[PDB]
Ligand SMILES: Cc1ccc(C(=O)c2ccc(O)c([N+](=O)[O-])c2)cc1
């Protein structure tokens with residue numbers, strides 16, 4: 512599994528469960544093509560977005576639907592979503608974990624990149 | 628000044644100077660229309676982006692060109708840019724500060740919204 | 743003003759107002775000696791803690807009383823306080839801003855050190 | 858394992874390996890008594906600090922030796938250490954993960970608390 516997303520909730524001190532995530536890849540025409548999507552599990556993790564064969568070099572956007580997450584909890588947050596945009600696999604295949612820590616008016620995101 | 632952007636560097640413990648910032652406003656057809664832009668000052672701040680008259684309710688995107696910032700320092704970074712997408716709402720307080728704290732493989736962002 | 747402390751609230755998107763802040767300086771016997779204290783202003787800032795004459799090189803601790811802040815808002819928080827421990831060094835730039843961004847179960851802190 | 862520590866490096870986009878961690882517990886005389894210590898593994902994680910029986914209610918301080926970590930890499934950082942101070946187990950036993958994301962002039966820390 513070459514792309515994993517993990518989301519934490521800084522208000523509750525818990526995994527952020529049921530967070531929708533949409534991944535896009537920049538196409539040759541420079542538009543954002545839908546690539547994969549899913550939701551975080553009870554551990555805050557989202558596995559199985561893609562395969563090593565399909566996850567080719569390119570520019571990818573991971574959109575974490577933070578507003579939908581906070582609104583489903585009956586909280587009015589600031590951001591629409593958190594967007595994480597990066598070039599992947601340009602030095603050969605890597606494994607990427609995109610992590611995010613959410614509050615209603617703030618978030619932080621980090622990447623852990625490993626070479627299998 | 629209804630919108631200010633502040634950028635900080637977590638590697639050097641300093642303002643992030645001469646960072647390009649582009650602001651867009653979501654149009655009726657869901658595209659992003661250029662709205663305002665500039666470069667951060669020696670204090671890491673970008674003032675003067677817009678006016679109260681122009682900054683109507685709607686969805687805005689602030690794009691911070693972090694990749695060029697790190698490369699100018701001779702550092703290889705992870706992200707293409709940092710993006711902050713939010714709704715401006717007239718019910719809340721009137722002044723928006725979008726702050727970003729940058730590292731090569733991470734960033735955080737907060738909003739400080741005051742009267 | 744060689745040392746300033748700024749505190750922000752990530753739940754409400756605001757300065758963290760009336761937060762108690764205590765600064766200590768490490769003594770020769772490794773204990774923490776009271777050095778300066780105050781409460782953050784309506785802007786989330788605490789100015790005036792010390793003077794250039796008094797702020798000599800050494801190890802300092804800034805303790806931010808986050809638990810009382812959250813409880814006054816009716817929120818149950820994780821940490822007893824936030825602590826920032828650092829060395830003041832005359833070789834580096836002269837002005838230190840210690841910034842903290844607070845959530846109930848998390849906080850971040852950065853240093854912005856400038857001339 | 859009721860207390861785990863995870864540390865990430867925001868400059869390299871990797872686990873922070875070989876980070877020393879010292880845990881203290883406030884004693885009846887209000888001093889900080891040494892409680893447990895260890896170092897992060899190649900995954901950035903530190904397991905096995907304590908046991909459910911020994912990890913009683915109290916106020917605990919987790920000291921993450923960030924300066925020692927950056928200096929071992931030949932980097933001059935700002936902070937001496939990151940200190941995480943919290944009351945544990947006051948509503949019965951819980952499992953705590955203390956996470957930290959490190960940069961030379963900044964860090965963020967979060968807690969994930971679960972009820973077994
Ligand atoms: C159990 C666990 C806890 C924390 C993390 C983590 O990666 C993490 C910790 C603090 C953070 O501010 C961010 N972030 O996204 O910026 C990520 C990962 C796993």
Ligand SMILES: Cc1ccc(C(=O)c2ccc(O)c([N+](=O)[O-])c2)cc1
Pocket residue numbers: 633635724726727728735736737739748750841842843850851852854963964
């Ligand atoms: C108006 C203003 C807003 C933010 C900051 C700032 O320094 C800041 C911004 C984002 C952060 O995650 C942190 N932090 O403590 O980790 C600090 C400084 C000034």
